[PDB]
Amino acid sequence: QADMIVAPLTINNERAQYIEFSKPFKYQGLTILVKKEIPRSTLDSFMQ
């Protein structure tokens, strides 16, 4: 259905056994993304 994939496509070993890849056009890793937490001290009161 298509002859050449042009998209962000990570190189693995399983898929590499059925296709031929090329040299990567970008190097990247897998970093966890989390929602940024806004700092705010609790300090219920001066009585604490």
């Binding site: 190189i11 890849f21 040299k23 990567p24 190097y27």
Partner: protein, 51 residues
């Protein structure tokens, strides 16, 4: 084979064929370690303008 510290290059690619890279190489920059500032507007910081 020529396993070693061989950087994949366009010119080398047309006389020999390489494998999938196992170590990344680029063009980086060094600098001495920075001591660190103290936010020169620090005196008004440990509070809020509302307070």
């Amino acid at each position: 084979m020529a396993i070693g510290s061989l950087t994949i290059n366009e010119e080398r690619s047309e006389i020999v064929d390489f494998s999938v890279p196992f170590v990344e190489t680029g063009i980086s920059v060094m600098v001495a370690r920075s001591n660190g500032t103290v936010s020169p507007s620090a005196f008004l910081e440990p509070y809020s303008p509302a307070v």
